[PDB]
Amino acid sequence: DERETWSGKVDFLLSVIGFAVDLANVWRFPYLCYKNGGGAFLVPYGIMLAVGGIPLFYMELALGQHNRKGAITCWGRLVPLFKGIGYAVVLIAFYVDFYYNVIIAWSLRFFFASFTNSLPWTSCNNIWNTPNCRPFEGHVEGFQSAASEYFNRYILELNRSEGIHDLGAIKWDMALCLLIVYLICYFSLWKGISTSGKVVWFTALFPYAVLLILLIRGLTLPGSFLGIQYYLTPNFSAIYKAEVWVDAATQVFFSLGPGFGVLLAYASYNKYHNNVYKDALLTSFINSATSFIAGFVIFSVLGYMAHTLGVRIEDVATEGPGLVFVVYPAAIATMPASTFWALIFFMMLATLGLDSSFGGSEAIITALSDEFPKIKRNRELFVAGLFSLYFVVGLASCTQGGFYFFHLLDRYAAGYSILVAVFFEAIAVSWIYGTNRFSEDIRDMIGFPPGRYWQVCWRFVAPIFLLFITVYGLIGYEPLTYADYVYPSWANALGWCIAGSSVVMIPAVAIFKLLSTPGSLRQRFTILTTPWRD
Amino acid sequence: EVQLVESGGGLVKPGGSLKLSCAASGFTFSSYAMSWVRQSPEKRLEWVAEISSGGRYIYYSDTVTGRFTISRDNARNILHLEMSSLRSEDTAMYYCARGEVRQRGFDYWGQGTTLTVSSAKTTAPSVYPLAPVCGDTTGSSVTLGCLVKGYFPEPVTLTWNSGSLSSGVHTFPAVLQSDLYTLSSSVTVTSSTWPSQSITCNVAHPASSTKVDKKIEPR
Amino acid sequence: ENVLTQSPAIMSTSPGEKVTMTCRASSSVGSSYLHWYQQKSGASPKLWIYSTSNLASGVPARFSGSGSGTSYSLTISSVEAEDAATYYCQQFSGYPLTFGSGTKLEMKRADAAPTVSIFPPSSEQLTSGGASVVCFLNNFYPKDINVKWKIDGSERQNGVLNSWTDQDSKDSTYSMSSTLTLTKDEYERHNSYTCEATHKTSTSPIVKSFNRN
Ligand SMILES: CC(C)CCC[C@@H](C)[C@H]1CC[C@H]2[C@@H]3CC=C4C[C@@H](O)CC[C@]4(C)[C@H]3CC[C@]12C
Ligand SMILES: CC(C)CCC[C@@H](C)[C@H]1CC[C@H]2[C@@H]3CC=C4C[C@@H](O)CC[C@]4(C)[C@H]3CC[C@]12C
Ligand SMILES: OC[C@H]1O[C@H](O[C@H]2[C@H](O)[C@@H](O)[C@@H](O)O[C@@H]2CO)[C@H](O)[C@@H](O)[C@@H]1O
Ligand SMILES: COC(=O)[C@H]1[C@@H](c2ccc(I)cc2)C[C@@H]2CC[C@H]1N2C
Ligand SMILES: [Cl-]
Ligand code: NA
Ligand code: NA
């Protein structure tokens, strides 16, 4: 008494499945398989997934659902001292919402430019091109491919920007796509999860439709089999390699959505006795299975290119947006009925980003809705007052220097910020709140306590897991750079400012809570660490 | 291995209160949740209350809700049940069980402790030796008996020759009538087993502290 | 409250013969949330079947379980004397937790006439003015038997305490203890006390008379 609940729980599943499955699934996982020991990468991947990844994902879903409240109130309910974690987690998603919807806008901007039987990115003869242009991907950074130039020169107009200090004029063709996205988001998140959980039926399930079409499309392509070899052909030498276990650990962590408070928010709308743990691993499996399936969708087209298009495999296979907005479309244009694959592909990218942003924004709304009764009864005015903030600042990503702004938040906005956030999540839950109390909570929900396995991972494996990633993250750290452009020392300082801005709340809200509570130290401590009961 | 020992319970006047305890051993108590399941004299199983591992989640049946308080000690591995304003309908043998995994039910139960809520005063049984009729002719194996009548409350320990001969021994269950129990026990020995040897009915009624032996010739 | 009713309440089966007992719920219950318990006579209930298909530790494979929704059934492949008990189902689907009516399983055996033994009031009884005659009916099948108390030639009804022993694990028979309680003042009033047992085994009631002589 009293909270809105998911309609069918397939709403919740598809909502969480949708949130968990995004562009990273397509442009990252496959690259890591190609990069590390082929299919042998699955070994460290699975291991890191079992001990590190799922236990954290399981945690948030079980945590949010039980406490039955938004991210902030959830940690305010759990460990009021660490309630800053709820604050930190929510504004982490608040930050991401700025640069993230840009990729969907890109997807739509490509979706708009994709109506024709002549695709613009297959040509080096166009107005925006360069004498250095290639028909397809090349080794030399100086010479961009044809599809690469289209993305950089036309859509982004990134060449107009000398760096981050120069954003350049706004591209209003881009801002339209951005707003078109927010309109989709607003009307999806308008009435709350009631409408949200219903919308995810498309956004979450559409990609799988497209993935099948493209998977069938790719595997039929000449040399398609060759791509899978570059994909799944195992080198177990990588298994011994430390960097591979890091990529596995990192990917499994960032592939699942913990730390954004979305899972906390989403699962909280669940029925109290609704099985989470079943949903936890079901959602997790579908997520990883999706990437695995998508992996074939990607490298099937790559083997085609290396065969039919005469392109070096290492040149075409790439992570990040470069794969989706350049490499892949480049092969589609060569394919018969290109416009079809293009249209559905870019629609897939949008649908892959849409249900994700739903969760992210939902985490802010839900967290605030439970914390503040005003905006709770005020909603749909809030998402406007929110998304309006986004789009206004979103114009910064619609500029000619757009990607430069994007890439900055991408490496910062959800940073180590989420690592230390989730680390304090795991530590606050496993030690501060205790595993004895947590397993006790789930038993009262799903009917049975979490296995000895799960408790161990939360207490030990997870913390070192995040630590294993956070340490190896700082060990390979380099000042932010894209292409030949290196970000200035002030630009990096702002990125860290964004990273700290979240996590700083944890200690800050800790001191704020400590200063607000009377009594001696040990007294002031326990009172702040005493859970919402009663 | 796992042992659940349940203690307390006894006679309690209606409206009164009584505390029950279950001594758990052979498993980590703080890990497993516990539940009190009671069974009426009519053999009716009713879940009373459940307490979680940490004991921060408590469930009561609509019957005993608010009257009963189920406590827990994880340090001493002891599950209590705090009863208040007891009712005649609350008369039953309470069980201590776990109780942790809902999908697996209750895997281990205690021996059980008996609770009797009645206004009837405790009375000691009058043990009556039963000697066969003097009529001819005696059969191959003659039956002897012992009558325990007008005693309250249960239980009563009735054995034969200090529990030596169990062969052909039927000890009938008590039957409550007008707030008093009447019990009887039959034993069949050989024609010459009695009264050649010593056949005596020993009765134990701990409630009134009545310990009685009956050895009788066919006088 | 989810009400779990079982049936039959009292079931008779000879060793080796297959038996099926059912548990039907007023409300639907998750197939994983329903469990069965076996309580032997004078023994604490023990977990028998959990999650409706799953035998417990030490439970013979002869046992089985099935059903779903509001209908579940416990079945024994070939019944044995060891299996004689009262079986209770259970639902954890939601609180309050509830147990089934229970199914008492009793082994069937060959019909055996009761051994009827009448006993007079003890010498130590009439002291308080009490007189109570006891009539033992031992080792007989089937369970139900009706004693008839007759003082002189006329039957007496009021003041009869019947007690029934549960089926023993040895010969699988029953026993009944009838106690006719009177007053010593009224005891001397009638000379001859007779209790008779009307049973299935014989159309002729088993009669036991007596007198002080
Ligand atoms: C590998 C890709 C293609 C599919 C995803 C595989 C994942 C879901 C598999 C691989 C190893 C599996 C884990 C192995 C160990 C256990 C122990 C068990 O007590 C809980 C489930 C859990 C934690 C499994 C969850 C599912 C799991 C993590
Ligand atoms: C490339 C091809 C094989 C991909 C196709 C995979 C599709 C069919 C899979 C992936 C994720 C799956 C969904 C994941 C969530 C659920 C939960 C369940 O309560 C209803 C089914 C439903 C909605 C699944 C339906 C089938 C599903 C959509
Ligand atoms: O939102 C669509 C966006 O792009 C349009 O460009 C199309 C059009 O066919 C030509 O302009 C040419 O550039 O091909 C493009 C498709 O690849 C519009 O040019 C632009 O104004 C509009 O905003
Ligand atoms: C960093 O932003 C994201 O991509 C995260 C998430 C996300 C969180 C907030 C927002 I606003 C958008 C996406 C989408 C998926 C699920 C976790 C992670 N992606 C794998
Ligand atoms: Cl992934
Ligand atoms: Na992912
Ligand atoms: Na998504």
**What total number of domains does chain A contain?**
1
Q: What separation in angstroms does the CA of A205 have from each of A18, A112, A322, C54? A: 8, 22, 24, 37
| Ligand 1, atom nearest to A453 Cα | 19
Nearest atom, ligand 1, residue A451 CA? 19
CA distance readout (Å), C131 to A414, A471, C119: 93, 93, 11
Residue B178: exposure state from Cβ atoms within 10 A (0-12, 13-18, ≥19): exposed
Of the residues C89, C109, C129, which one is the last residue of a structural domain?
A: C109
Distance of CA A127 to the CA centre of its chain: 35
**Would you tell me the crossing angle of helices A435-446 and A277-304 to the nearest 10 degrees?**
90
**β-pair partners for C211:** C192
Six-digit token string for A474: 């700082």
Upstream peptide bond of B155 is cis (omega within 30 degrees of 0): yes
Which token pair is C171?
């010969």
d(CA B110, CA B34): 11
Question: Which H/E stretch holds residue C35?
Answer: strand C34-39
- Rounded to whole angstroms, the Cα distance separating B186 from B148 reads 11
Fold of B1-119: Immunoglobulin-like (2.60.40)
The two structure tokens encoding residue C66: 């099935």
Q: How far is A450 from chain B (nearest CA, A)?
A: 10
DSSP secondary structure, A39-73, as one string: GGGHHHHHHHIIIIIHHHHHHHHHHHHHHTS-HHH
For residues A210 and A347, is the Cβ–Cβ distance under 8 A?
yes
CA A292 to chain CA mean position, Å: 16
Domain residue limits at C116: 110-211
As a CATH number, domain B120-219 is 2.60.40.10
3-state secondary structure of A151: helix
Distance CA C8, CA C73 (A): 11
- Contact check, Cβ <8 Å, A448/B56: no
Nearest to B186 among C35, C95, C138 (CB): C138
Residues C148 and C70 in one domain: no
Q: Are residues C37 and C19 in the same domain?
A: yes
Burial environment of residue B158 by CB neighbours within 10 A (0 to 12, 13 to 18, 19 or more):
buried
Place of tokens 């004895």: A436
How far is the CA of C114 from the CAs of A294, B141, C23, C108, C143, in angstroms?
Answer: 80, 14, 35, 16, 10
Q: If we measure between CA atoms, which residue out of B45, B86, B88, B44 comes closest to residue B64?
A: B86
Query: Based on the domain organization, do C151 and C92 belong to the same domain?
Result: no
Determine the Cα–Cα distance for residues C14 and C33; give it in Å rounded to an integer. Answer: 31
Number of domains present in the structure of chain C: 2
- A352 appears as a binding residue in the annotation: yes
| A112 CB near ligand 3 (under 6 Å) | yes
- Which mutation among A181, A290, A356 tests ligand 4's pocket best, with the greatest number of atoms within 8 A of CB? A356
Strand partners, B81: B20
A459, A435 contact by CB (below 8 A): yes
Phi-psi group of B158: left, alpha or beta (phi > 0 → left; psi -120 to 50 → alpha; rest → beta): beta
Burial code (b: 16+ CB inside 10 Å, e: under 16) for B76-96 equals ebbbbbebeebeeebbbbbbb
Q: Does residue C95 sit in the same domain as residue C122?
A: no
Encoded amino acid at C113, one letter? A
The tokens for A170 are 């706004």
Cα(B172)–Cα(A182) distance, integer angstroms = 82
* Axis-axis angle for helices A338-371, A71-78 (nearest 10): 40
The structure's method of determination equals X-ray
User: What is the domain range of residue A508?
Assistant: 1-534
What the block records as the tokens of A329 is 């479309």
Same domain, C121 and C206: yes
Residues C167, C70 within the same domain? no
Domain end among C109, C136, C154: C109
Separation between Cα atoms, residue C194 and residue C155, nearest integer Å: 9
Which residues of chain C lie closer than 8 angstroms to A273, CB-CB? 94
Q: Which of A462, A514, A486 lies closest to A57 in space, CA to CA?
A: A462
Hey, how many other C-beta atoms are within 10 angstroms of the C-beta on A135?
Answer: 16
Measured between CA atoms, how close is A274 to chain C, in angstroms? Answer: 12
A373 to chain C, any CB pair closer than 8 A? The answer is no
Spatial separation of the C-alpha atoms in residues A449 and A443, rounded to whole Å: 4
Domain end point (choices C62, C81, C109): C109
The candidate with the shortest Cα–Cα distance to C167, out of B128, B173, B92, is: B173
* Separation in Å, CA A320 to CA A30, A141, A298, A327: 11, 16, 13, 11
d(CA A51, CA A465): 8
- Three-class DSSP category at B188: strand
- In terms of DSSP bridges, do strands C46-50 and C146-151 run parallel, antiparallel, or are they unpaired? unpaired
Q: Is C96 on the interface with B (CB under 8 A)?
A: yes
CATH code assigned at C124: 2.60.40.10
State whether residue A532 sits within 8 Å of chain B by CB. no
Q: Is A255 annotated as a binding residue?
A: yes
Following DSSP, what letter does each residue of A174-239 receive, concatenated? Answer: HHHHHHHHHHHHHHHHSS-HHHHHHHHHHHTTHHHHHHHHHHHHHHTSTTHHHHHHHHH---THHH
Determine the Cα–Cα distance for residues B150 and B173; give it in Å rounded to an integer: 13
Chain B, residues 152-211, CB within 8 A of chain C, namely 170-175, 177, 182-184, 186, 188
Q: Report whether A20 belongs to an annotated binding site.
A: yes
* Partners of C136 in the β-ladder: C117, C177
- Distance, in Å, from the CA atom of B154 to the CA atom of B123, rounded to the nearest integer, reads 10
Neighbours of C212 (CB within 10 A): 10
- From the CB of A257, is ligand 4 less than 6 Å away? yes
CA distance C113 to C175: 11
Residue B27 sits at the chain A interface (C-beta within 8 Å): no
Query: Whats the size of chain B, residue-wise?
Result: 219
Give ranges for CATH 2.60.40.10 in chain B. Answer: 1-119, 120-219
Q: Which residue has the tokens 């979706």?
A: A111
Give chain C's length: 213
- Per-residue burial over A202-211, b if 16 or more Cβ lie within 10 Å, else e, is bbbebbbebb
Helix A206-219 vs helix A338-371: angle between axes, to the nearest 10 degrees?
150
Nearest chain A residue to C30, by CA = A447
Q: Are residues C98 and C198 in the same domain?
A: no
Asked if the bond preceding A2 is cis, omega within 30° of 0, the reply is: yes
Pairing of strands C115-119, C46-50: unpaired
Distance CA A376, CA C4 (A): 43
* Pairing label, strands B113-117, B11-12: parallel
**Helix pair A416-427, A54-67: axis angle to 10 deg:** 60
Q: In what order do the strands lie in the sheet with C193-199?
A: C154-156, C146-151, C193-199, C202-208
Instruction: Please tell me the distance between residue A317's alpha carbon and the centre of ligand 3 in angstroms.
Output: 28
Q: Which atom of ligand 2 is nearest to the CA of A289?
A: 10
Question: Which residues of B fall within a CB distance of 8 Å from C175?
Answer: 170, 172, 186
Return the amino acid letter for A524.
R
Q: Are C36 and C74 in contact (CB under 8 A)?
A: yes
Indicate if C49 and C72 belong to the same structural domain.
yes
